[PDB]
Design a protein around this ligand. Structure first.
Ligand SMILES: *[C@@H]1O[C@H](CO)[C@@H](O[C@@H]2O[C@H](CO)[C@@H](O[C@@H]3O[C@H](CO[C@@H]4O[C@H](CO)[C@@H](O[C@H]5O[C@H](CO)[C@@H](O)[C@H](O)[C@@H]5O)[C@H](O)[C@@H]4O)[C@@H](O)[C@H](O[C@H]4O[C@H](CO)[C@@H](O)[C@H](O)[C@@H]4O)[C@@H]3O)[C@H](O)[C@H]2NC(C)=O)[C@H](O)[C@H]1NC(C)=O
Ligand SMILES: *[C@@H]1O[C@H](CO)[C@@H](O[C@@H]2O[C@H](CO)[C@@H](O[C@@H]3O[C@H](CO)[C@@H](O)[C@H](O)[C@@H]3O)[C@H](O)[C@H]2NC(C)=O)[C@H](O)[C@H]1NC(C)=O
Ligand SMILES: *[C@@H]1O[C@H](CO)[C@@H](O[C@@H]2O[C@H](CO)[C@@H](O)[C@H](O)[C@H]2NC(C)=O)[C@H](O)[C@H]1NC(C)=O
Ligand SMILES: *[C@@H]1O[C@H](CO)[C@@H](O[C@@H]2O[C@H](CO)[C@@H](O)[C@H](O)[C@H]2NC(C)=O)[C@H](O)[C@H]1NC(C)=O
Ligand SMILES: *[C@@H]1O[C@H](CO)[C@@H](O[C@@H]2O[C@H](CO)[C@@H](O)[C@H](O)[C@H]2NC(C)=O)[C@H](O)[C@H]1NC(C)=O
Ligand SMILES: *[C@@H]1O[C@H](CO)[C@@H](O[C@@H]2O[C@H](CO)[C@@H](O)[C@H](O)[C@H]2NC(C)=O)[C@H](O)[C@H]1NC(C)=O
Ligand SMILES: *[C@@H]1O[C@H](CO)[C@@H](O[C@@H]2O[C@H](CO)[C@@H](O)[C@H](O)[C@H]2NC(C)=O)[C@H](O)[C@H]1NC(C)=O
Ligand SMILES: *[C@@H]1O[C@H](CO)[C@@H](O)[C@H](O)[C@H]1NC(C)=O
Ligand SMILES: *[C@@H]1O[C@H](CO)[C@@H](O)[C@H](O)[C@H]1NC(C)=O
Ligand SMILES: *[C@@H]1O[C@H](CO)[C@@H](O)[C@H](O)[C@H]1NC(C)=O
Ligand SMILES: *[C@@H]1O[C@H](CO)[C@@H](O)[C@H](O)[C@H]1NC(C)=O
Ligand SMILES: *[C@@H]1O[C@H](CO)[C@@H](O)[C@H](O)[C@H]1NC(C)=O
Ligand SMILES: *[C@@H]1O[C@H](CO)[C@@H](O)[C@H](O)[C@H]1NC(C)=O
Ligand SMILES: [Mn+2]
Ligand SMILES: [Mn+2]
Ligand SMILES: [Mn+2]
Ligand SMILES: [Mn+2]
Ligand SMILES: [Mn+2]
Ligand SMILES: [Mn+2]
Ligand SMILES: [Mn+2]
Ligand SMILES: [Mn+2]
Lengths: 90, 690, 920
């Protein structure tokens, strides 16, 4: 219940991704996004987005080689507690 | 004549000097008994005693060195000396005082070394990215204000011990972020990475080599980092001749002292440096967090300026924290640390905007008074600081030092210094109580031969019961009714009866509930006045009719403080400029104003009347506030001539007035939350046509 | 003040084991011997594989000074599986909390970790062990199915523990619910009856516990300390816990109901990071049978003489009244970095004076930063702020600070002396010290002289050496002393007698004892406890007549007495102590007969006369009140004449007048001894014939009850003569007057509206506040500056609504600030618009009338009036280019005062506010 249920791809023009999740019921501190290389040695990488923004952007991928994208929700408690890794393969 | 010293004062040479600073003693090499014993040197001198036998020490405020205030403090010959004078020798006789002055200057180009203390908890991963090239970006901005710049980096997360540290599972010790399916490095208490150096590319090299860790509880201990970065000046390399700025960047709350009891840490923090050759705070797991008092003490001693760079959600917490640590400034830090490059320059302006003197090693036997001269020639008594200054200005302070009595403390010295500055004013206090004639000491039997007496400085005080120059004064039927001197006024009672006259010396009996002194038994203790039922309010010694107020107390009742801190408002002005400050309490002068700092005045004129006085002297260079040359001191508002009186009225006031040119001027007054107040001015006002 | 620091009981455990981190008494019902319980965390035990498990040692008062560890667990780590421990128990700090009721001992391990039985984790849940006789159970209320940081895994239960009056424990844990904190209360029987060694998470019936709250309350550390006591009328001890990090680290103290765990009261520290709530305690400090709160803020920073901040720490003292909210005072520390409020320990009634006493300790202050414990005695008026005894640490600082006073416990009488004693722990040097209280003896002594007047020609007694009649008199010194507790039957007093104490080393003696022929004498006395005021006699032969020339100087008989250390108890060196504030000496004065007439007795006629320079005294403020006293003795000499000035409760006497010569100085002292306040002035001893003295006494009155018409001053002269010893009591009063400086002020915001209005168009029926015109704001303030206050007043506002059937200033709304209600005779804002000189005379008038309540000195009443300039009426046809001055006036009338039965007779004034509109 601490996980957004959204983020199917939007605006697939550039060598990037524009994802958009929708309003988890609990208060959100930050959002964490990971990506990259489904079946390979996995050059995974991330970046931080404030909890008020519902969109993000990624960079540095091959010409549409079907990456894997995950998004985490960060609880406003402790230093950094999170959970609910909703994922999509695009 | 008989003013204070001739009568009620003649006891001995050392006691004559302790009565009044205007008294004097003599040793006239003969015995003209009369009354040339202890007297003013305008009357005792006329008593024909001056073969340099006059003992009249004068209080001296001699300066031992005063280097001139330099213009630019970078580069050339030596000794920037932003404070003048430096060493003066104070010499005071009992119950006397002298006064001196001191000028301090914010030098044009003063070296600055800034140390970046950064939180490395997981909420700062975004911040560590955008700070990659902000080392050289900060170089170009600080180059304008200072040619000699240094930068260093330091890291902290929290104490690496439970319950703060991720202690389990064992699969997550080298990776405290395990459930996150990513990799972070093990958490650390305080990590010093780059020492202070003048290579701004070296800063960017150690950045992006650092990585972000993870913690468990929201309060992150950075006071351990602040304490270490202050007292490890050898390790991190503080320039002893440069402006020290320590920027503290975090987005969450902080641990305070006594929080370490949960982790089983009960040893108090010491001001000692514990960062070793491994560049890690070793005592992090064994020593508690430092308190605000200990942080304030060592921050002042090392002349370090602490800058709080925190987010808006927690900025109010550090606002109140900084109020408990004077001299520190807080600034809004963006979530991604994109504002640090500008926030540093803004903070260094505020730090160099104020000058406040601090006293160290002050002997409590003497108190210091302060009249401050911050503006052109307008003096502000009771204040030891100046606010609203730009780099290059010079302010003055006049200081008076008064002693209660005089000790034999072996001429200990003390320091007067502005906060955060290296240059200081050292004052060597000396006390000359005793007379120079005591060295001979003439022990017992010169002119008081038998029935062993004494001889000192030309007088004899012989034994327990015998009295006077001539002696034996004995305890038997020896019966003089002395005359006319045991009492003044020619008809008063005998010796103002507490003890009676025996041979004239008035040995005062009834010695209880305090001591009875004085030549006519005139003096005593406990004879002073009360304020709330406590004599001299407990803030002053009682000297025979009067209270000798302790340090930082004045008045007949000694119930009036010299403190101006309770008069200080939130904007900086004492009593908001609407009233005087007397005994730590404001007395408002502007009609309709009241409150502790006269902050409440609902019937005062609106801001339109007040702020238009700035737009006249600043934009039109005329009107009031201009001929006093106080235009660009009271007017710190940003003013820009614009057109159409724009729409954004989030919280603003439109003001219209008619100038002496009989034209209508329109302007505005806007402010960002807890920030600055800007003034828009509509250009091309409306004037009569034709 | 009665603690013995000479021969205390020293205890020492193994070094490095924090011996003394927590101390308490042990008073089992099964025996008469009482023991010491000293916790010792970080102590290596015989538990297999457990490093520094901690101990709780039982030290005895049997004088062998030996401490024996108490077996609580004695077992290693239980296993969740093979090579998978369920608990870890190493460095668990078992012993950091020790508290004991009659026969039961409760010890806890706040750093005990747990495996959580679901996933592999090490969560500091904390555990406790309750032992009653041979049986030992485990109480771990925070070890439950609520696992992670959002639950109770980091709770560290047992961080602070306590017992209630009837078998119920109060447990605190600071780490529950993301370090919000938690209080858990359980019945002692439930803890023992429901214990199951094969169940790790036990649910207890009748468990009172605080629940999780909003995330803003995180990192508050509730349960950091605990105290018990009754704060309502239920009779059951309620819960008191400190929350040092609550309210943005201001510090808070919560008081929960000990019955249904509901909030009762609160406290909040005034300074951030001061750790308000590090230490708490509850005791009746004023004998009211109502518990009073004590809160410690060791890191509180106060202001010194300079005004800079210094960390001395302060302790919050809150007296509970039977009505409701407490009366809270503050008590600052003494030394910097001393942490004055680190430990607050009640110790029964130490001096047995009828009021309980408390001890506050600064573990890091004093000489060499060894540690200081301050003792504070209670009084009828509350807690005496002046410490009566200081206890200094006696041990070095080898590795860490000795922390002498970091933990204390009192309110138990370990010996039979009848006085409660105190335990002080160090844990820095791994030591604990026991200070025993000494019995208090209140002693009173009388001194009498037969007779007080001596006649030199009346020689009766014969000198022992040679037979010559000498004038003589008698002196009797009676001595009685008693006390409570265990103190010996007979006490050894050593008393010294001094004749003519006034004259001293260089002077005549004028009086010696008969047989000893000496001015001084000593006597060894021995009295009994109850009554029996024993006396002795040696008689005072006067010196040879006409041999000293000094008459009129009273021969002062002075008796001072001490107590020999001979008599003590079987306690091996615990001697009693005299009362704290009692005179150790008493004086009597005899006088030589001189100028007492042919009757040989001095009969004076004393007279007091006082005129009124001051006439009126204004209610509400202090003011100078000077009285001129005319004391004259028309008669023979008056021995020991004194001026008695009986003052009211509002007097607050201060000093005497010096600046005048017509009135000379006087020796006056303020004193209140027996049920009355008064000022005593010396009028000369003896006050000879004539002697017309003038003097003045200054006063500053703080009036009372607001209904008193006058203030009472009764004056008379007293003396030691047998006949006509006093003067007629003369009374002087000055009337209370009412004076209230009330002013009315007004201002227009803005005071100018230039025309035309930029970007303005005319709507025939607008609701904009923009289509109408600019906002003109009139602010009226009615302020009472005078010392006296008034209860009711009337305010009338005259507003120029219209002029020639069209609006001038359309009033949108008006607001009130202060005790005032207002009503407009016309409906404000009738159009429902939402966000030369024209006065209320020649123009249309709209009135606003207001009623004013009680206004004191520092309070005022403000009326904000937000109006709109109706631009349509101006600028159109009849007012095209002309300057108009919109004038509004306001008047006030004060009609009532709270000082009925006193002259008032009027208060009234007025003012006006103008808003000028012009062209160009
Ligand atoms: C001494 O100081 C103590 C420390 O502050 C005081 O204790 C505090 O008293 C407050 C007043 O009673 C109390 O505030 C109330 O909190 C409860 C908490 O229950 C909640 O239940 C919900 C579901 O679990 C959740 O709250 C929802 O709504 C809030 C907004 O209120 C959201 O922020 C949440 O996300 C969630 O959606 C919470 O999880 C929580 O468990 C509230 O129910 C109360 O609501 C009341 O007000 C609303 C209007 O705002 C009414 O409609 C409603 O009917 C209630 O009347 C209050 O917010 C604090 O929790 C409590 N704190 C602690 C630590 O005890 C103590 O009162 C004081 N005593 C004295 C004598 O001064
Ligand atoms: C220290 O103690 C002295 C003596 O107790 C105080 O002197 C008193 O000060 C007041 C003003 O604060 C004097 O004025 C008197 O008060 C009314 C108030 O409305 C004023 O209007 C009158 O002029 C009236 O004289 C007062 O004369 C003076 N002496 C007294 C009361 O005997 C002094 O204020 C104290 N200072 C502090 C800082 O507490
Ligand atoms: C600071 O300025 C004040 C100004 O009054 C000085 O006050 C002195 O004390 C008397 C008492 O009222 C004043 O009337 C005089 O102006 C001053 N006496 C002199 C100059 O002899 C005060 O001395 C000044 N302090 C310093 C350190 O300069
Ligand atoms: C101050 O300026 C004018 C007053 O004449 C106000 O004007 C508004 O903002 C712009 C600039 O004039 C224009 O769109 C309109 O004149 C006004 N806004 C609207 C929506 O009509 C301005 O609001 C005033 N601001 C304050 C704070 O008083
Ligand atoms: C309890 O015993 C342990 C045994 O390990 C002691 O811990 C060792 O102490 C020595 C010296 O103090 C250190 O050199 C060792 O490194 C410690 N062991 C470990 C594993 O770190 C401990 O000091 C003892 N404590 C007491 C109070 O006796
Ligand atoms: C004369 O002196 C005698 C002795 O000093 C006085 O008699 C004493 O009277 C007091 C009480 O006033 C007794 O306590 C003493 O015991 C008496 N002493 C005796 C009787 O030797 C006597 O009062 C004095 N005055 C006279 C006789 O007029
Ligand atoms: C202002 O109006 C209120 C409301 O009638 C008056 O009544 C006060 O407040 C409540 C009603 O809400 C009453 O029960 C109280 O008895 C009243 N309080 C006091 C102090 O009288 C109130 O009196 C009016 N105040 C004035 C100054 O006229
Ligand atoms: C003291 O007065 C002024 C400052 O108050 C100072 O400049 C001056 O030198 C001193 N005067 C004397 C006579 O010491
Ligand atoms: C900071 O202090 C001010 C007044 O001292 C207070 O109004 C404000 O609430 C405080 N802020 C916080 C976050 O405590
Ligand atoms: C809790 O306290 C007492 C029960 O003894 C009662 O007066 C009060 O109403 C109770 N309140 C709640 C909410 O349980
Ligand atoms: C006698 O007692 C007083 C207090 O009543 C005390 O001040 C004094 O020191 C004592 N000793 C004397 C007067 O010798
Ligand atoms: C308005 O005009 C009147 C004319 O007498 C004047 O008294 C008043 O001061 C003026 N108000 C201003 C200038 O605010
Ligand atoms: C009204 O106040 C004025 C000063 O504003 C004063 O001169 C006048 O005496 C006062 N009149 C009354 C009746 O209070
Ligand atoms: Mn963090
Ligand atoms: Mn961030
Ligand atoms: Mn943390
Ligand atoms: Mn109760
Ligand atoms: Mn009480
Ligand atoms: Mn007591
Ligand atoms: Mn005892
Ligand atoms: Mn007579």
């Amino acid at each position: 219940s601490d996980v957004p249920r959204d983020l199917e791809v939007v605006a697939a023009t550039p060598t990037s991704l524009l994802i958009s999740w929708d309003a988890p019921a609990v208060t959100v501190r930050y959002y964490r996004i990971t990506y990259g290389e489904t079946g390979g040695n996995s050059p995974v990488q991330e970046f931080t987005v404030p909890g008020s923004k519902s969109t993000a952007t990624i960079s540095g991928l091959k010409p549409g080689v079907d990456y894997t994208i995950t998004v985490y929700a960060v609880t406003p408690r402790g230093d950094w507690n999170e959970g609910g890794p909703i994922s999509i393969n695009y | 004549g008989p003013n204070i010293c001739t009568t009620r004062g003649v006891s001995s040479c050392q006691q004559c000097l302790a009565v009044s600073p205007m008294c004097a003693w003599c040793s006239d090499e003969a015995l003209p008994l009369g009354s040339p014993r202890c007297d003013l040197k305008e009357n005792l001198l006329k008593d024909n005693c001056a073969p340099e036998s006059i003992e009249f020490p004068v209080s001296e405020a001699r300066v031992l060195e005063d280097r001139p205030l330099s213009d630019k403090g970078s580069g050339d010959s030596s000794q920037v000396t932003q404070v003048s004078p430096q060493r003066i020798a104070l010499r005071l006789r009992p119950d006397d005082s002298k006064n001196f002055s001191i000028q301090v200057r914010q030098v044009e180009d003063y070296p600055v070394d800034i140390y970046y203390l950064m939180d490395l908890s997981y909420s700062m991963k975004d911040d560590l990215w955008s700070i990659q090239n902000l080392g050289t970006k900060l170089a170009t901005q600080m180059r304008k204000l200072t040619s000699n710049l240094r930068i260093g980096f330091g890291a902290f997360v929290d104490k690496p011990v439970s319950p703060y540290m991720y202690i389990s599972p064992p699969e997550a010790l080298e990776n405290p972020c395990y459930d996150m399916k990513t990799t972070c490095l093990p958490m650390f208490g305080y990590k010093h990475v780059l020492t202070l150096t003048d290579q701004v590319t070296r800063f960017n090299e150690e950045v992006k080599k650092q990585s972000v860790s993870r913690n468990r509880d929201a309060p992150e201990g950075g006071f351990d980092a602040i304490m270490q970065a202050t007292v490890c000046d050898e390790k991190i390399g503080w320039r002893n001749d440069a402006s020290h700025l320590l920027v503290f960047t975090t987005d969450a709350k902080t641990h305070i002292a006594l929080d370490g009891r949960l982790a089983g840490i009960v040893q108090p923090n010491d001001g000692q440096c514990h960062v070793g050759s491994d560049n890690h705070y070793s005592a992090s797991t064994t020593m508690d967090y430092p308190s605000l008092g200990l942080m304030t003490e060592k921050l002042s001693q090392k002349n370090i300026n602490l800058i709080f760079a925190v987010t808006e959600n927690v900025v109010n917490l550090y606002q109140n924290y900084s109020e408990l640590i004077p001299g520190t400034t807080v600034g809004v830090l963006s979530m991604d640390s994109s504002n640090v490059l500008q926030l540093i320059v803004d903070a260094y302006g505020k730090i160099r905007s104020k000058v406040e003197l601090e006293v160290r090693d002050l002997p409590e036997e003497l108190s210091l008074s302060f009249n401050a001269t911050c503006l052109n020639n307008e003096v502000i008594p009771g204040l030891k600081s100046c606010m609203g200054l730009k780099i290059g200005d010079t302010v003055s302070f006049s200081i008076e030092a008064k002693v209660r009595g005089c000790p034999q403390e072996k001429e200990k010295s003390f320091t007067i210094k502005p906060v955060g500055f290296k240059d200081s004013l050292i004052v060597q206090v000396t006390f000359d109580c005793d007379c120079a004639c005591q060295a001979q000491a003439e022990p017992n039997s010169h002119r008081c031969n038998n029935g062993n007496g004494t001889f000192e400085c030309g007088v004899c005080r012989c034994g327990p019961g015998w009295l006077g120059s001539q002696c034996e004064c004995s305890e038997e039927d020896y019966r003089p009714s002395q005359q006319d001197e045991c009492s003044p006024r020619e008809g008063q009672p005998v010796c103002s009866q507490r003890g009676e006259c025996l041979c004239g010396q008035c040995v005062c009996h009834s010695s209880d509930f305090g001591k009875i002194t004085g030549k006519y038994c005139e003096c005593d203790d406990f004879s002073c006045v009360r304020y709330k039922g406590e004599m001299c309010s407990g803030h002053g010694q009682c000297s025979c009719g009067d209270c000798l107020c302790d340090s930082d107390w004045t008045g007949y009742y000694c119930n009036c403080t010299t403190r101006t801190d309770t008069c200080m408002s939130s904007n900086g002005l004492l009593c908001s400029g609407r009233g005087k400050c007397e005994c730590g309490s404001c007395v408002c002068i502007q009609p309709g104003s009241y409150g502790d700092t006269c902050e409440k005045c609902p019937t005062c004129p609106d801001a339109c009347t007040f702020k238009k006085e700035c737009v006249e002297c600043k934009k039109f260079d005329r009107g009031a506030l201009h001929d006093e040359n106080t235009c660009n001191r009271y007017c710190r508002d940003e003013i820009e001539s614009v057109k159409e009186l724009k729409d954004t009225g989030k919280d603003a006031v439109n003001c219209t007035y008619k100038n002496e040119d009989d034209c209508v001027v329109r302007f505005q007054y806007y402010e960002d939350s807890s920030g600055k107040s800007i003034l828009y001015v509509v250009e091309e006002p409306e004037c009569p046509k034709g | 003040f009665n603690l013995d620091v000479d021969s205390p009981a020293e205890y020492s455990g193994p070094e490095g084991s924090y011996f003394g981190f927590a101390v308490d008494f042990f008073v089992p019902s099964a025996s008469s011997r009482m023991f010491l319980l000293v916790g010792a965390p970080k102590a290596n035990t015989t538990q297999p594989g457990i490093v520094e498990g901690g101990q709780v040692l039982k030290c005895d008062w049997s004088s062998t000074r030996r401490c024996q560890p108490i077996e609580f667990d004695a077992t290693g780590n239980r296993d969740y599986a093979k090579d998978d421990p369920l608990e870890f128990k190493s460095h668990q700090w078992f012993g950091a909390s020790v508290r004991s009721k009659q026969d039961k001992i409760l010890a806890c391990a706040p750093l005990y970790h747990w495996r959580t039985e679901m996933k592999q984790e090490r969560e500091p849940v904390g555990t406790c062990f309750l032992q009653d006789g041979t049986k030992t159970v485990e109480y771990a209320p925070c070890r439950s199915q609520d696992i992670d940081a959002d639950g109770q895994g980091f709770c560290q239960g047992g961080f602070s523990i306590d017992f209630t009056k009837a078998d119920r424990v109060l447990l605190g844990g600071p780490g529950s619910f993301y370090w919000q904190g938690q209080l858990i209360s359980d019945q002692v029987a439930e803890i023992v009856s429901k214990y199951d060694p094969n169940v790790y998470s036990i649910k207890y019936n009748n468990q009172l516990a605080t629940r999780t709250a909003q995330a803003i309350f995180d990192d508050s550390y509730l349960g950091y300390s605990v105290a018990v006591g009754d704060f309502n009328g239920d009779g059951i001890d309620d819960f008191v816990s400190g929350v040092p990090r609550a309210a943005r680290t201001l510090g808070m103290v919560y008081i929960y109901d000990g019955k249904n765990m509901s909030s009762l009261y609160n406290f909040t520290g005034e300074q951030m990071a001061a750790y308000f709530g590090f230490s708490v305690a509850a005791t009746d400090i004023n004998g009211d049978d109502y518990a009073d709160v004590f809160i410690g803020a060791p890191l509180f920073m106060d202001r010194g003489s300079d005004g800079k901040l210094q960390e001395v720490g302060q302790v919050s003292v809150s007296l509970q009244r039977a009505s409701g909210d407490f009366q809270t005072t503050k008590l600052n520390g003494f030394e910097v970095f001393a942490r004055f409020g680190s430990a607050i320990a009640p110790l029964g009634d130490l001096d047995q004076d009828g009021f309980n006493d408390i001890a506050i300790a600064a573990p890091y202050g004093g000489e060499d930063k060894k540690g200081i414990v301050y003792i504070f005695n209670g009084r009828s008026t509350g807690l005496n702020a002046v410490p009566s005894q200081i206890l200094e640490g006696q041990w070095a600082a080898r590795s860490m600070p000795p922390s002498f006073g970091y933990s204390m416990k009192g309110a138990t009488d370990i010996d039979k002396n009848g006085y409660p004693d105190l335990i002080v722990g160090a844990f820095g040097v791994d030591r604990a010290i026991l200070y025993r209280a000494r019995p208090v003896i209140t002693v009173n002594a009388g001194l009498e002289v037969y007779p007080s007047i001596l006649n030199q020609d009346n020689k009766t007694c014969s000198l022992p050496g040679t037979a010559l009649k000498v004038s003589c008199f008698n002196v009797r010194f009676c001595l009685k002393a008693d006390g409570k507790g265990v103190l010996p039957r007979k006490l050894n007093f050593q008393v010294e007698l001094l004749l003519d104490k006034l004259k001293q080393k260089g002077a005549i003696r004028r009086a010696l004892f008969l047989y000893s022929r000496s001015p001084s004498h000593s006597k060894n006395m021995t009295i009994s406890r109850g009554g029996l005021m024993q006396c002795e006699e040696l008689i005072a032969y006067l010196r040879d007549e006409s041999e000293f020339r000094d008459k009129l100087t009273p021969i002062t008989i002075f008796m001072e007495y001490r107590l020999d250390y001979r008599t003590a108890a079987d306690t091996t060196g615990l001697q009693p102590i005299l009362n704290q504030f009692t005179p150790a000496n008493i004086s009597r004065q005899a006088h030589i007969l001189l100028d007492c007439g042919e009757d040989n007795v001095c009969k004076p006629k004393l007279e007091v006369s006082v005129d009124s320079d001051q006439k009126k005294i204004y209610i509400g403020d202090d003011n100078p009140l000077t009285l001129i006293v005319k004391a004259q003795n028309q008669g023979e000499g008056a021995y020991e004449a004194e001026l008695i000035v009986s003052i009211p409760l509002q007097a607050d006497f201060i000093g005497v007048v010096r600046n005048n010569e017509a009135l000379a100085r006087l020796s006056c002292a303020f004193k209140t001894e027996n049920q009355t306040r008064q000022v005593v002035c010396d009028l000369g001893n003896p006050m000879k014939a004539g002697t017309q003295l003038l003097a003045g006494l200054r006063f500053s009155v703080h009036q009372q009850s607001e209904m008193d018409t006058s203030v009472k001053f009764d004056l008379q002269i007293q003396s030691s003569n047998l006949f006509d010893k006093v003067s007629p009591v003369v009374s002087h009063k000055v009337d209370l007057a009412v004076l209230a400086a009330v002013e009315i002020r007004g201002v227009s915001s803005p005071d100018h509206v230039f025309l035309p209005i930029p970007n303005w168009e005319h709507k025939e029926n607008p609701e904009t506040e923009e289509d109408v015109g600019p906002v003109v704001q009139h602010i009226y303030e009615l302020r009472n500056n005078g010392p006296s206050s008034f209860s009711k007043a009337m305010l009338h506002l005259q507003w120029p609504y219209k002029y020639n059937n069209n609006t001038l200033l359309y009033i949108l709304h008006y607001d009130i600030d202060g005790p005032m209600n207002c009503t407009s005779d016309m409906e404000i804002n009738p159009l429902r618009i939402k966000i030369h000189t024209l006065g209320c005379g020649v123009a249309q008038c709209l009135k606003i009338v207001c009623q004013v309540g009680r206004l004191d000195r520092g309070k005022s009443a403000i009326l904000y009036v937000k109006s709109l300039l109706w631009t349509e009426t101006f600028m159109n046809k009849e007012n095209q280019n002309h300057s108009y001055s919109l004038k509004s006036s306001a008047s006030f009338n004060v009609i009532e005062f709270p000082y009925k039965n006193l002259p008032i007779e009027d208060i009234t004034n007025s003012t006006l506010v103008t808003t000028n509109v012009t062209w160009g």
